[PDB]
Point group: C2
Chain length 113, copies 2
């Protein structure tokens, strides 16, 4: 049984405009992949979600972040990929990570927000 890569947008302004579905993907993740650890930590703290491993997906270390996320998915854990607040949110590194999961045949599920 494989984990799912959930792709989750963060709202601008009030974090209570997230959905329960979206926050559930964070609670249920083996790790949270993100491009802004500070904003991600603030988001987790807002919802009382403690102890989550954060995986940075910056360009330089992208290959390493991809390996880390693939390993978790293949081990059966979901991973949440959190994009910086904004809509639309541009992230080439994020896309690269989702692409890698899809190429490996792993489920990639966007979460409505």
């Amino acid at each position: 049984h494989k984990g799912t890569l959930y792709v989750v947008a963060t709202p601008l302004g009030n974090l209570d405009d997230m959905t329960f579905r979206a926050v559930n993907t964070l609670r249920n993740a083996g790790a949270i992949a993100c491009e802004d650890t500070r904003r991600t930590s603030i988001l987790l703290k807002h919802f009382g979600i403690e102890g989550k491993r954060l995986v940075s997906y910056h360009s330089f270390n992208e290959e390493r972040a991809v390996r880390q996320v693939i390993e978790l998915l293949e081990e059966g854990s979901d991973v949440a990929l959190v994009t910086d607040a904004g809509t639309p949110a541009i992230s080439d590194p994020g896309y690269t990570m989702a692409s890698a999961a899809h190429a490996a045949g792993l489920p990639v599920v966007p979460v409505p927000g």
Copy 2:
């Protein structure tokens, strides 16, 4: 030799008139509009009275052709607007391949809020 910009424009399913002027004007004056859902995009354009626009329609099997068309237009100094759905993350939209290709080509990719 001035590079065109790929503008990524998020569009809602309803209440289209709540889109910003900036976003509608971007679509109105774009050199071409790239979209994965041509039917939905035509409905949007008709709504705002945007007539005669060149559309680049993205399909998996013909991914290359849509990407090539967009990159060629950007290299020729024309802006292109990629429409995506407002409610899901842009990096999940299959059409994001066109934004990642523009980035790979050193072309500007700009979100329109």
